[PDB]
From TrEMBL, chain C:
It comes from Saffold virus (SafV). This is Genome polyprotein. It is found in: Host cytoplasmic vesicle membrane; Host nucleus, Host nucleolus; Virion. Interacts with host EIF4E. Interacts with the leader protein. Interacts with host RAN; the complex L-RAN recruits cellular kinases responsible for the L-induced nucleocytoplasmic trafficking inhibition. The complex L-RAN can further bind to the host exportins XPO1/CRM1 and CSE1L/CAS. Interacts with the protein 2A. Interacts with host RNASEL; this interaction prevents RNASEL activation by its substrate 2'-5' oligoadenylates. Belongs to the picornaviruses polyprotein family. Replicates the genomic and antigenomic RNAs by recognizing replications specific signals. Performs VPg uridylylation. Disulfide bonds join C29-C31.
Length: 258, 252, 174, 252, 252, 258
């Protein structure tokens, strides 16, 4: 009913029929103001970049447990070729400042059970935790390919070998997921909605970001209640997301990164 | 009453919503961020075995350096760095015990309770001598990211740390009370400091230690003169941004 | 599946890496050959304006799912992946209470008017493709047929026009 | 955006509904029914082997009669009728080829594109001689359903077709340009004519050919004089009613 | 007087600038583009050996087709195309002589003098029979890029070219004067037509003949009936854009 | 003196000290209006694309004769990686409409002699003429690598073998260079100026261009008077150009071309 919602962005448009509204993190929106830390007049209002970029994220199975999650580093998740003009413009600029408008999608049925927590978090560790190796430029800002387990992050994850780990009780990349709900979020309850709509402004340690070195925002999808269904019900349950950079402004035009 | 948590937020109710009751609110403001953090908490310890009139030389002794990195987050010598750098994790001092003290320096109260992603504030530092022997020390404060200037004495028998225009303190004598306190302004080139994690690198070839922000501190304190000194931090005009999870606590 | 002509396409509990259907935007598409739009357009030389592609979900009320309907302008060829398709004009169609989705192929052209037919495709007679992808798999409970049928229709949009009355290539009915 | 086709109608959208776009409408009116059909299209062919000054006698020669039934729909001799009647289907002239010409007369453009159930209009007829030999012909126009009057000459050596008060044309000589054109009003007793099918019979004992409406034409044209003549129809002040399907086209 | 051609333009002087003289200008407007091109010039030739009442079939005979592509630029059968297409160059008809006629059709006056890159106009076409034998012909005009419809006759002994709603002309008899003239509007989907070269391809896989623009013509003329006919073009409301070089002429 | 001129465009700026002014072809400028043939709102005012792209063009030697020339197909000359954000945006759009602001540079000395004709021409044949092969997508819109001779274009160049060429007196890609001066131009006279400044609006057979199939504008540098100098004078004389797309507007966003 009042749950039918359409949202336009450039030459793209998202549509849902089970929305529970859009949550604005910090009650703020990125207004697109130029960073006062740059003298060069920024490149902005690029319609071809102010749109929704949709990508498949993961398959939800009965094996996932509460707090298992998928991470989507930003803006990096869209710095690839599929980032269209947002990407091609980003790659050719030293700095970028922007917010995010996101909708994650996931449908099941009236006979399926389970729920996900969809949230945005600033300075949320996106590094690989299945190794004791130091994170690198090409391994630190990648969209998770597999669901991440939860136990190994409560007290953090030090990039040191297994035997040293014993004398390291806490790492600064710790994430007490029991409170992940304090981050701007929404819940995707299979019985209620098939979409979640969020939007966050630009936050960072500085006016604009040298994105090549920093993924300030992270979109995270964690299961809260495990997926359940009986014999006969659809077994393929997938999660998708439409990500829109809100009024991105670019500074420091230069040759592209490789 | 009923609601829908999937919205991202539900109402903050009191007993009157569902029952025959009244609000019972009483004024209180000791929960304000500024007030809460505006108090001195132990955050570091320093040790020196060289006299005042000598050349300052970086040293370590049983996990205690004679210089400090001003940051509530864990700091310590990292991979044989000349001076303490910000750490990404805490380690026990003992290789056996599996119990504290830790070898890393930090404001335990800040680490254990920092429900925000970024913070802004001035720093009131207090330095106290651990015993009653008359103090005779010189401390040099170096602004965030400024040159450490670990040079030789330019004149004989003078404290090299005092051979600077940088703010420095000199306390000595039986008239003193074995301590020093002062307040410094936020000096980092960053607008706000990351309170827990920094999801990125600090250099253009992304070779730094992922997780540590560039120049995320309030400077450093170099000390010379005999003694062991404990350090306190007091966060003045404290401002925090972006709520985030607290350190997890083992289930009782 | 037997090369027979039907007014709909199928979808099920999976998300193919290729589009479910692909319609080249030309009033000459064999795909819309028997639509009233094409029937009328055959008697005119040029068109201009929006095109409306109407999709009607006929699956059960218990079936859910999301499609990504994309319109890719020409120049770089047909979109080979969802990544490419979503880089062009698109709308995400979510199933639910309302049964159909009215998708508009914007009139994006180097020329003010475009040809209705052609011998060989030219930049004034062929305008790209409309592909519908499965964003999320069609999902449903037990006791529901795996295949859902989506009716497909076309027509000129609100600002659609045709001009220059002509006779189309004659043929023998059969 | 979303809609519900079961309603019986959905909105006519433009790019602005779902996207950041503008309407791009340009004025145009060549799609108006009146304008579209107001042009001459080949609709029939006639052939005569008898001279002007003789008695007109209905004849057929390789599927060509010397009289015509004025209707865009298929017409031809039906079950040995004296004159052409409206057909219900089209047949190839050749019993072998399975390719046109057809043996039935009609406005191919009208049959292939008549997206309406009923139509109303006046008829502009054009009759042209297929070769350059000097014309010498007499044509008689008989209003819809009026007597054909296929009688004998009442006077020697006179064209029997001209022996009438019915509108008739007489063209002859090297000063002429081998053609005739004129416009006739709608003369059928019906208010509007069925453009494709007529779901009924034309007589009270329902014995007629189901599918053909009674008096659904604009009259007839009888011709005498040597030659083969092609005929064109132009629909004046054309009005159509009740949209309906167009002729199906084989899938490419 | 002095000037600087490197500027990109110098003044248009008269005798008074450097000498004791007066301007001698007299009003004149026969140099206006519209006036200059508003006159009929030979631009094509057509030939047919089939009668009016027959099926039109594309044919060539000593470099003359029975259909024409309406464009002042060179046109001819290109790489065995069914109908004439726009050429990119002119060739002699004879493989030996190295002298005209050319095998390609065009308005020589337009090709030899078209000092502009683009042009816009309506086209007045004149078609004349090359001998005094009484004419008997049917011509079909097909708008730019519209279907040629080279189909069979739908009815016996009728000119297939007339079996259309497309504009067509039919002239026959000793009362006629062996010619046809009419004016058609600009029908190309392009805003303006390239007068000489088109630096590009016409399809998305860039496989077409580089140099030829898509749909850069005024349609086509198909003809049936006996005879050879010369064609003239008259450019109505002619407008030209972007000055460019004229065809080079051999040095005397 | 009044010949010192600076021109800013985005984060770029050209400077000359011997300008003879800027010539505006057709006395028109591209105003950046959106094409009325496209319903989608165009992407425009992209500061990172509205700048000067500078490239080396050719070396001028004593061997060049009057009318030998170098061609620069537009927008193609800048559709490569060195086209920065103008390029990356262009490659991801079906249509592009824009004008050109250009300055070609070439210095010598008070002791050198010679002159060049710098002009812009619409629908100016840029195809390869050193072959009888049909021009293709990757050979038709390339910046000349070598000086083009002049004789073979007066009457055009048919893409037919040498023996057929005999019966082909004229080709539509003919260029009577004796009148090349009728195209918007300027002259680079070594004794007078070291730079030429031109600007042309957008012209084409239609509202906006499907650039992938068409190079509507061509920048051409032809020698008018051969280069001359005596023993001892600098022998390396090179030609350069700064090309700026004037208020480009893009329509039909899609995946990139390869």
């Amino acid at each position: 009913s009042d749950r039918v919602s359409s949202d336009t962005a450039g030459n793209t448009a998202t549509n849902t029929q089970s929305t529970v509204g859009r949550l604005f993190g910090f009650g703020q929106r990125h207004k697109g103001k130029h960073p006062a830390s740059c003298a060069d007049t920024a490149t902005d209002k690029v319609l071809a970049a102010e749109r929704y970029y949709t990508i498949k994220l993961a398959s939800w199975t009965k094996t996932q447990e509460s707090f298992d999650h998928i991470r989507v580093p930003l803006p990096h998740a869209l710095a690839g070729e599929n980032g269209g003009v947002f990407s091609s413009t980003l790659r050719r600029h030293y700095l970028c400042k922007c917010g995010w408008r996101i909708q994650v999608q996931c449908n099941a049925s009236q006979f399926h059970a389970g729920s996900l927590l969809v949230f945005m978090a600033p300075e949320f560790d996106t590094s690989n935790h299945s190794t004791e190796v130091e994170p690198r430029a090409d391994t630190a800002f990648k969209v998770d390919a597999n669901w991440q387990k939860h136990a190994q992050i409560l007290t953090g994850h030090a990039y040191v070998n297994t035997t040293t780990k014993v004398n390291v009780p806490l790492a600064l990349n710790h994430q007490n997921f029991w409170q992940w709900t304090t981050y701007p979020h929404q819940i995707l309850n299979l019985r209620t909605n098939t979409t979640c709509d969020l939007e966050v402004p630009y936050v960072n340690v500085c006016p604009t970001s040298s994105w090549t070195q920093h993924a300030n925002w992270t979109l995270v999808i964690a299961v809260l209640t495990p997926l359940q269904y009986s014999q006969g019900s659809a077994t393929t349950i997938e999660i998708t997301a439409s990500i829109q950079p809100v009024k991105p402004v670019f500074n420091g035009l230069r040759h592209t990164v490789v | 009453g009923v609601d829908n948590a999937e919205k991202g937020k539900v109402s903050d109710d009191n007993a009157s919503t569902d029952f025959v009751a009244e609000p019972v609110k009483l004024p209180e403001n000791q929960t304000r961020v500024s007030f809460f953090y505006d108090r001195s908490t132990l955050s570091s310890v320093l040790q020196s075995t060289s006299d005042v009139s000598s050349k300052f030389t970086p040293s370590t002794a049983k996990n205690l350096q004679n210089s400090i990195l001003l940051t509530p987050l864990p700091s310590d010598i990292v991979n044989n760095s000349v001076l303490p750098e910000q750490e990404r994790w805490i380690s026990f001092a003992s290789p056996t015990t599996q119990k504290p003290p830790y070898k890393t320096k930090q404001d335990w109260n800040f680490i254990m309770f920092s429900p925000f992603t970024y913070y802004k504030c001035d720093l009131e530092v207090t330095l106290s001598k651990n015993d009653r022997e008359t103090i005779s020390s010189v401390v040099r404060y170096v602004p965030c990211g400024a040159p450490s200037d670990l040079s030789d004495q330019t004149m004989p028998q003078t404290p090299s740390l005092a051979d600077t225009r940088d703010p420095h303190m000199w306390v000595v004598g039986q008239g003193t009370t074995n301590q020093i306190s002062f307040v410094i302004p936020y000096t980092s080139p960053l607008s706000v400091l990351p309170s827990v994690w920094f999801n990125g690198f600090s250099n253009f070839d992304n070779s730094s230690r992922f997780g540590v922000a560039p120049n995320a501190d309030f400077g450093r304190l170099l000390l010379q003169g005999q003694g062991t000194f404990s350090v306190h931090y007091r966060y003045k005009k404290m401002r925090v941004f972006c709520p985030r999870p607290t350190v997890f606590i083992p289930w009782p | 599946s037997n090369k027979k002509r039907i007014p709909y396409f199928s979808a099920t509990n999976s998300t193919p890496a290729t589009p479910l259907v692909t319609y080249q935007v030309t009033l000459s598409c064999s795909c819309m050959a028997n639509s009233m739009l094409a029937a009328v357009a055959r008697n005119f030389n040029q068109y201009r304006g929006s095109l409306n592609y109407l999709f009607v979900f006929t699956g059960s009320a218990m079936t859910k799912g999301k499609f990504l309907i994309s319109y890719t302008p020409p120049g770089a060829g047909e979109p080979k992946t969802l990544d490419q398709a979503m880089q062009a004009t698109y709308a995400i169609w979510d199933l639910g209470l309302n049964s159909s989705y009215n998708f508009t192929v914007p009139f994006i052209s180097p020329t003010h008017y475009r040809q209705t037919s052609y011998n060989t495709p030219t930049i004034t007679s062929v305008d790209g493709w409309l592909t519908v992808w499965q964003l999320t798999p069609l999902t449903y409970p037990l006791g529901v047929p795996n295949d859902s049928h989506i009716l497909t229709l076309v027509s000129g949009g609100d600002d659609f026009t045709l001009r220059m009355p002509v006779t189309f290539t004659k043929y023998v009915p059969q």
